[PDB]
Design a protein around this motif. Structure first.
Motif, PDB file in Angstrom:
ATOM      1  N   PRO A 158       0.803  -1.234   0.000  1.00 18.36           N
ATOM      2  CA  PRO A 158       0.000   0.000   0.000  1.00 18.36           C
ATOM      3  C   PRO A 158       0.829   1.274   0.000  1.00 18.36           C
ATOM      4  O   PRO A 158       0.354   2.311  -0.480  1.00 18.36           O
ATOM      5  CB  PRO A 158      -0.839  -0.127   1.281  1.00 18.36           C
ATOM      6  CG  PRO A 158      -0.148  -1.161   2.108  1.00 18.36           C
ATOM      7  CD  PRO A 158       0.482  -2.104   1.143  1.00 18.36           C
ATOM      8  N   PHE A 159       2.050   1.234   0.535  1.00 20.99           N
ATOM      9  CA  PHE A 159       2.884   2.430   0.551  1.00 20.99           C
ATOM     10  C   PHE A 159       3.228   2.882  -0.863  1.00 20.99           C
ATOM     11  O   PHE A 159       3.242   4.085  -1.154  1.00 20.99           O
ATOM     12  CB  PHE A 159       4.154   2.172   1.357  1.00 20.99           C
ATOM     13  CG  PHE A 159       5.041   3.370   1.483  1.00 20.99           C
ATOM     14  CD1 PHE A 159       4.740   4.375   2.382  1.00 20.99           C
ATOM     15  CD2 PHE A 159       6.176   3.491   0.702  1.00 20.99           C
ATOM     16  CE1 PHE A 159       5.553   5.481   2.501  1.00 20.99           C
ATOM     17  CE2 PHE A 159       6.994   4.595   0.816  1.00 20.99           C
ATOM     18  CZ  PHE A 159       6.682   5.590   1.717  1.00 20.99           C
ATOM     19  N   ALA A 160       3.522   1.933  -1.752  1.00 22.45           N
ATOM     20  CA  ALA A 160       3.757   2.284  -3.147  1.00 22.45           C
ATOM     21  C   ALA A 160       2.517   2.920  -3.760  1.00 22.45           C
ATOM     22  O   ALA A 160       2.623   3.853  -4.564  1.00 22.45           O
ATOM     23  CB  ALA A 160       4.177   1.047  -3.936  1.00 22.45           C
ATOM     24  N   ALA A 161       1.333   2.425  -3.392  1.00 18.84           N
ATOM     25  CA  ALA A 161       0.100   3.040  -3.863  1.00 18.84           C
ATOM     26  C   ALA A 161      -0.008   4.482  -3.393  1.00 18.84           C
ATOM     27  O   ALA A 161      -0.376   5.371  -4.169  1.00 18.84           O
ATOM     28  CB  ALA A 161      -1.106   2.234  -3.383  1.00 18.84           C
ATOM     29  N   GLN A 162       0.310   4.729  -2.121  1.00 20.47           N
ATOM     30  CA  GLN A 162       0.292   6.090  -1.596  1.00 20.47           C
ATOM     31  C   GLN A 162       1.239   6.988  -2.379  1.00 20.47           C
ATOM     32  O   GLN A 162       0.873   8.098  -2.787  1.00 20.47           O
ATOM     33  CB  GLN A 162       0.672   6.072  -0.114  1.00 20.47           C
ATOM     34  CG  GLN A 162       0.049   7.174   0.718  1.00 20.47           C
ATOM     35  CD  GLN A 162       0.215   6.941   2.204  1.00 20.47           C
ATOM     36  OE1 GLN A 162       1.309   6.634   2.676  1.00 20.47           O
ATOM     37  NE2 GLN A 162      -0.871   7.089   2.952  1.00 20.47           N
ATOM     38  N   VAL A 163       2.461   6.510  -2.611  1.00 18.45           N
ATOM     39  CA  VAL A 163       3.459   7.313  -3.315  1.00 18.45           C
ATOM     40  C   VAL A 163       2.985   7.636  -4.726  1.00 18.45           C
ATOM     41  O   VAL A 163       3.054   8.787  -5.174  1.00 18.45           O
ATOM     42  CB  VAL A 163       4.816   6.588  -3.328  1.00 18.45           C
ATOM     43  CG1 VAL A 163       5.710   7.148  -4.417  1.00 18.45           C
ATOM     44  CG2 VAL A 163       5.490   6.707  -1.975  1.00 18.45           C
ATOM     45  N   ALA A 164       2.488   6.628  -5.447  1.00 19.12           N
ATOM     46  CA  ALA A 164       2.053   6.857  -6.822  1.00 19.12           C
ATOM     47  C   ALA A 164       0.864   7.807  -6.879  1.00 19.12           C
ATOM     48  O   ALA A 164       0.817   8.704  -7.730  1.00 19.12           O
ATOM     49  CB  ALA A 164       1.710   5.529  -7.495  1.00 19.12           C
ATOM     50  N   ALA A 165      -0.108   7.631  -5.979  1.00 20.47           N
ATOM     51  CA  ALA A 165      -1.284   8.492  -5.998  1.00 20.47           C
ATOM     52  C   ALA A 165      -0.916   9.935  -5.690  1.00 20.47           C
ATOM     53  O   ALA A 165      -1.393  10.860  -6.359  1.00 20.47           O
ATOM     54  CB  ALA A 165      -2.329   7.980  -5.010  1.00 20.47           C
ATOM     55  N   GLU A 166      -0.061  10.155  -4.688  1.00 28.62           N
ATOM     56  CA  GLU A 166       0.325  11.526  -4.375  1.00 28.62           C
ATOM     57  C   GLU A 166       1.146  12.136  -5.505  1.00 28.62           C
ATOM     58  O   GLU A 166       1.002  13.325  -5.807  1.00 28.62           O
ATOM     59  CB  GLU A 166       1.080  11.587  -3.046  1.00 28.62           C
ATOM     60  CG  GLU A 166       2.411  10.869  -3.016  1.00 28.62           C
ATOM     61  CD  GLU A 166       3.567  11.767  -3.401  1.00 28.62           C
ATOM     62  OE1 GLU A 166       3.506  12.977  -3.099  1.00 28.62           O
ATOM     63  OE2 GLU A 166       4.536  11.264  -4.008  1.00 28.62           O
ATOM     64  N   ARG A 167       2.006  11.342  -6.149  1.00 29.96           N
ATOM     65  CA  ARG A 167       2.791  11.868  -7.259  1.00 29.96           C
ATOM     66  C   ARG A 167       1.893  12.292  -8.414  1.00 29.96           C
ATOM     67  O   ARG A 167       2.071  13.375  -8.986  1.00 29.96           O
ATOM     68  CB  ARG A 167       3.807  10.824  -7.712  1.00 29.96           C
ATOM     69  CG  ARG A 167       4.591  11.200  -8.950  1.00 29.96           C
ATOM     70  CD  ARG A 167       5.693  10.190  -9.195  1.00 29.96           C
ATOM     71  NE  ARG A 167       6.264   9.725  -7.937  1.00 29.96           N
ATOM     72  CZ  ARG A 167       7.438   9.118  -7.822  1.00 29.96           C
ATOM     73  NH1 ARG A 167       8.202   8.882  -8.876  1.00 29.96           N
ATOM     74  NH2 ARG A 167       7.854   8.734  -6.619  1.00 29.96           N
ATOM     75  N   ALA A 168       0.908  11.461  -8.757  1.00 25.49           N
ATOM     76  CA  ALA A 168      -0.008  11.820  -9.834  1.00 25.49           C
ATOM     77  C   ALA A 168      -0.855  13.032  -9.468  1.00 25.49           C
ATOM     78  O   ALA A 168      -1.102  13.898 -10.313  1.00 25.49           O
ATOM     79  CB  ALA A 168      -0.898  10.633 -10.191  1.00 25.49           C
TER      80      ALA A 168
END
Ligand SMILES: [Mg+2]
Ligand SMILES: [Mg+2]
Ligand SMILES: [Mg+2]
Ligand SMILES: [Mg+2]
Ligand SMILES: [Mg+2]
Ligand SMILES: [Mg+2]
Ligand SMILES: [Mg+2]
Ligand SMILES: [Mg+2]
Ligand SMILES: [Mg+2]
Ligand SMILES: [Mg+2]
Ligand SMILES: [Mg+2]
Ligand SMILES: [Mg+2]
Ligand SMILES: [Mg+2]
Ligand SMILES: [Mg+2]
Ligand SMILES: [Mg+2]
Ligand SMILES: [Mg+2]
Ligand SMILES: [Mg+2]
Ligand SMILES: [Mg+2]
Ligand SMILES: [Mg+2]
Ligand SMILES: [Mg+2]
Ligand SMILES: [Mg+2]
Ligand SMILES: [Mg+2]
Ligand SMILES: [Mg+2]
Ligand SMILES: [Mg+2]
Ligand SMILES: [Mg+2]
Ligand SMILES: [Mg+2]
Ligand SMILES: [Mg+2]
Ligand SMILES: [Mg+2]
Ligand SMILES: [Mg+2]
Ligand SMILES: [Mg+2]
Ligand SMILES: [Mg+2]
Ligand SMILES: [Mg+2]
Ligand SMILES: [Mg+2]
Ligand SMILES: [Mg+2]
Ligand SMILES: [Mg+2]
Ligand SMILES: [Mg+2]
Ligand SMILES: [Mg+2]
Ligand SMILES: [Mg+2]
Ligand SMILES: [Mg+2]
Ligand SMILES: [Mg+2]
Ligand SMILES: [Mg+2]
Lengths: 152, 62, 119
Positions: free
Chosen positions: C50-60
RNA sequence: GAGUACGGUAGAGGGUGGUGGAAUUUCCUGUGUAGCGGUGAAAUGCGUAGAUAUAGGAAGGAACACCAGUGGCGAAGGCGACCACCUGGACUGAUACUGACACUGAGGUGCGAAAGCGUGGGGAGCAAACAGGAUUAGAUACCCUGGUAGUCCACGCCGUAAACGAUGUCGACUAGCCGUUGGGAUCGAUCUUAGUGGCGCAGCUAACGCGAUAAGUCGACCGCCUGGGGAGUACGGCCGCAAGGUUAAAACUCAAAUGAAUUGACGGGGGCCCGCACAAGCGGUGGAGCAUGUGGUUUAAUUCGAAGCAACGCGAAGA
């Protein structure tokens, strides 16, 4: 163990300075049961710190220690199929011993005249954070940060 | 499935309501129950085991 | 050197077991910014966390903030982990979460799924 | 006993047409740009000849979420979207009617999962064969990416399954308790039928266990068995287009093969608990020289013994 019955014997035998942290640093630096040699080495390093820095060496030692104490570390875990490393925060007690161990280990291998000025140089370096011990602490921290995907 | 945000509700009731609605709909259960083909023999076997366990649990209260 | 403005868009989360993909469009469904957990620099098991999901969502979201976008309808699709992590990642970027829906497709009978793994 | 006539009840019972919504795939078009996918970790594969994602449109095939239940119907095999048409059976109540018209059944006759075969259609998903990537000592496998027959439809064939309740059909008797599906009565309760489940007294059984849905007490008829292999094989006959099915031996060979339960041991079964067993630390060995024991080699002799932990500074606390 499996019992959790082991006691915690308290040792506080500072001769003249009357410091607790100094006593544990004594126990850490002592080798082969040579207490007097450890006393002379640590006190020579302390006197060098005093004659160099106008600030009293007590607070210089304290601020060097507080600038080398880590907050989280990476620890291996057997998941059963892969080699994983998880970051865990330090127990409040363990960080002092970790700092002491790192400081003495890095001080043991300078190559200069004696451990008096070795520990003097390390205390001055870690007072503001230009020593190798602080660099390796930051490397451990960045391991823990780069492995944050697990965290838990 | 869908969630309503209203009365400037904090971003804690929103997620809890979304999760509650999702588990009420059982989306995760249905999507998990379709990742592989599950043959009718295994159908009947699993349902029979569920029936025997359910009856044992019902009886065990008395 | 082309510029345009948009307000009150919709953000899509595609959260499969292996990877999660975050994208932003308007109500018309035209891509503005997208980010992937594979592109965030994980490349492995970490990509599923889920941390990778957080990073990708915030980056987008931070990439899409250039267009304004004071309102978002975020819709999620997929049973993989990070189903709700990306929602909080988007909320961290500074958007207004107008609504949250799931569009996970559920066949009634449909085609038959593949054979069962024997591992 | 068996059957007929008359109202109702429930049901994925069967057949022929028509129509729905979810989803996958493929094609076309817009935005948009550097990854997608997959794994235990990877790679093959798909991408800047613009992919995945995202929005709209179109084509086509197949299966019918939620209801759904120890639930129902059917001789068995089996049968789940909705509607119309054709059609079999079963439950249920009263009266009237026929007056033994019954049970079983060698031969025969039909129905009979899946895979398979023939002719002609159709073809989305899945997927034997097959290609490639991994794993491995090897991997003609398990895992991954693709993928043809087949799976679907019409007509014909094939006759087999752990086609199982491993329990033939029919009828009559034998303590009870708790459910549940249809239907009746009497006043939520009591009784009574036809199914479908859980316990249990006698009784039975080698034991497990069965126990009004007997594997108990009895009757009527049929099928089948006679140590394990060879062998459900060979030859002959009959069926089949083929695959093959069915009926069905012998020589030879062994002294066993087998069922249920008991104690232990074991498991890449499970649950608790302990030990410097891990983890947390300190200090070493394995690299050098030397001492000492052993193995090997040599010698006339290197005197015998000790050999995983539990032999090797050991018998030897003095060649
Ligand atoms: Mg798969
Ligand atoms: Mg597309
Ligand atoms: Mg579409
Ligand atoms: Mg049946
Ligand atoms: Mg067939
Ligand atoms: Mg065929
Ligand atoms: Mg055919
Ligand atoms: Mg053909
Ligand atoms: Mg295909
Ligand atoms: Mg495959
Ligand atoms: Mg495929
Ligand atoms: Mg295919
Ligand atoms: Mg063929
Ligand atoms: Mg057909
Ligand atoms: Mg059957
Ligand atoms: Mg039999
Ligand atoms: Mg037998
Ligand atoms: Mg029979
Ligand atoms: Mg009988
Ligand atoms: Mg009969
Ligand atoms: Mg009978
Ligand atoms: Mg009877
Ligand atoms: Mg019983
Ligand atoms: Mg018996
Ligand atoms: Mg017996
Ligand atoms: Mg008799
Ligand atoms: Mg008889
Ligand atoms: Mg008899
Ligand atoms: Mg014989
Ligand atoms: Mg014999
Ligand atoms: Mg014989
Ligand atoms: Mg034969
Ligand atoms: Mg012969
Ligand atoms: Mg023959
Ligand atoms: Mg036995
Ligand atoms: Mg054991
Ligand atoms: Mg250890
Ligand atoms: Mg050595
Ligand atoms: Mg050596
Ligand atoms: Mg010897
Ligand atoms: Mg010794």
């Amino acid at each position: 163990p499996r019992r959790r019955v082991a006691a915690k014997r308290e040792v506080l035998a500072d001769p003249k300075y009357g410091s607790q942290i100094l006593a544990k640093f004594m126990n850490h630096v002592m080798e082969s049961g040579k207490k007097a040699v450890a006393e002379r080495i640590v006190y020579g390093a302390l006197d060098k710190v005093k004659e160099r820095g106008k600030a009293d060496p007590l607070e210089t030692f304290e601020k060097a220690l507080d600038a080398i104490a880590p907050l989280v570390e990476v620890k291996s875990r057997r998941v059963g199929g892969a080699t994983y490393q998880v970051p865990v925060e330090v127990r409040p007690s363990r960080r002092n011993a970790l700092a002491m161990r790192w400081l003495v280990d890095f001080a043991r291998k300078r190559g200069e005249k004696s451990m008096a000025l070795r520990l003097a140089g390390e205390l001055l370096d870690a007072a503001e954070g230009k020593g190798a011990a602080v660099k390796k602490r930051e490397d451990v921290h960045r391991m823990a940060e780069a492995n944050k995907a697990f965290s838990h | 499935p869908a969630v309503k945000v209203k009365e400037n509700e904090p971003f804690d009731v929103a997620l809890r309501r979304f999760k509650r609605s999702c588990e009420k709909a059982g989306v995760l259960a249905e999507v998990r129950s379709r990742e592989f083909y599950e043959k009718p023999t295994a159908e009947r076997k699993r349902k029979a085991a569920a029936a025997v366990k359910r009856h044992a649990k019902k009886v065990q209260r008395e | 050197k082309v510029k345009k403005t948009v307000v009150d868009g919709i953000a899509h989360i595609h959260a499969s077991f292996n990877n999660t993909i975050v994208t932003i469009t308007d109500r018309q469904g035209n891509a503005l910014s997208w980010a992937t957990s594979g592109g965030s620099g994980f490349r492995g098991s970490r990509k599923s966390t889920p941390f990778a999901a957080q990073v990708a969502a915030e980056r987008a979201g931070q990439a899409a903030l250039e267009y304004g976008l004071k309102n978002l309808d975020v819709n999620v699709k997929g049973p993989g982990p990070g189903r709700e992590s990306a929602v909080r990642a988007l909320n961290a970027c500074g958007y207004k979460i107008a609504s949250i829906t799931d569009v996970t497709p559920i066949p009634h009978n449909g085609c038959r799924p593949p054979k069962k793994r024997r591992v």
